[PDB]
Amino acid sequence: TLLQLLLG
Amino acid sequence: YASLTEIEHLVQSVCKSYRETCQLRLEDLLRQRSNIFSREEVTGYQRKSMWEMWERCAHHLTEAIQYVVEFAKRLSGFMELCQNDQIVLLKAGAMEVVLVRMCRAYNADNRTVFFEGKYGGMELFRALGCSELISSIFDFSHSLSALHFSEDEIALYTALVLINAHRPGLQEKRKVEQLQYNLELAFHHHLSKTHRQSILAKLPPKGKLRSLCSQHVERLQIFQHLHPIVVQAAFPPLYKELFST
Numbered sequence: 518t519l520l521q522l523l524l525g
Numbered sequence: 526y527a528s529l530t531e532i533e534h535l536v537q538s539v540c541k542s543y544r545e546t547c548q549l550r551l552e553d554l555l556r557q558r559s560n561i562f563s564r565e566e567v568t569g570y571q572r573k574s575m576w577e578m579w580e581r582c583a584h585h586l587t588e589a590i591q592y593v594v595e596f597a598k599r600l601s602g603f604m605e606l607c608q609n610d611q612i613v614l615l616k617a618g619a620m621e622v623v624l625v626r627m628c629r630a631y632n633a634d635n636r637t638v639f640f641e642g643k644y645g646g647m648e649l650f651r652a653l654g655c656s657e658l659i660s661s662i663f664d665f666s667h668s669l670s671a672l673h674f675s676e677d678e679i680a681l682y683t684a685l686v687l688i689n690a691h692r693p694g695l696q697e698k699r700k701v702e703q704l705q706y707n708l709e710l711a712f713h714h715h716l717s718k719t720h721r722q723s724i725l726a727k728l729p730p731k732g733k734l735r736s737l738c739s740q741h742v743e744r745l746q747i748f749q750h751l752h753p754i755v756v757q758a759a760f761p762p763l764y765k766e767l768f769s770t
């Protein structure tokens with residue numbers, strides 16, 4: 518998900 | 526069992542994370558107080574199509590959320606939690622932090638918020654077609670302005686807004702409880718030093734922030750059902766991930 522991506 | 530030095534370090538670490546992840550300088554916000562939307566400019570916003578206004582607002586809201594994600598990333602202990610629990614806290618808490626952070630952009634004297642360059646009342650947002658939610662948000666910000674928060678206080682408060690062990694679906698709930706408690710210690714420590722513990726009893730009930738967020742999700746449902754293509758084509762994908770059912 519996008520939240521995962523923004524957190525690395 | 527965080528020592529007094531650990532707590533003092535946690536205070537400074539939280540307030541630094543916050544200073545570095547604010548989209549707007551507090552000096553600019555007070556400088557632009559006299560800068561208020563005219564009667565002609567308000568009418569222009571009110572005569573925008575629903576889809577356009579929603580699209581604009583969703584973009585600006587997503588932008589603020591990107592800053593909240595950055596705040597979380599620099600927040601002492603947040604990255605120490607497991608991946609799943611980071612997601613859960615951010616997904617539930619991102620909008621809540623923005624709604625709190627809003628009081629920096631809110632003028633109590635004329636009941637206006639800083640939006641797209643100038644200050645305007647809740648009348649600006651009438652084309653959204655969710656006036657109960659908008660006025661609810663303006664009421665919430667008005668109640669926070671009565672508390673006269675300083676930057677450090679908002680920093681410590683928003684940290685507690687984000688790190689909330691009651692969020693459903695937490696895989697390692699106890700680790701979240703420990704960090705939450707330490708941030709409570711950090712919060713109470715700073716307040717007592719400044720003789721400001723009296724605001725704690727005046728803090729909004731935790732169910733009020735949930736209610737505003739529930740209200741936002743519902744108003745998106747109403748809009749997304751009437752305009753499904755707009756959301757799919759134009760809305761920031763993060764906004765859709767966080768708020769769409």
Ligand SMILES: CC(C)CCC[C@@H](C)[C@H]1CC[C@H]2[C@@H]3CC=C4C[C@@H](OS(=O)(=O)O)CC[C@]4(C)[C@H]3CC[C@]12C
Pocket residue numbers: 546547548549550579582583585586589592623626627629630638639640650653655659662744
């Ligand atoms: C329909 C749905 C989108 C309702 C939300 C409409 C309003 C209430 C939103 C849209 C755009 C939002 C702003 C976006 C961006 C910011 C900057 C942020 O600055 S910062 O320094 O705190 O990071 C403070 C909150 C603030 C002013 C938000 C308040 C809240 C805000 C006006």
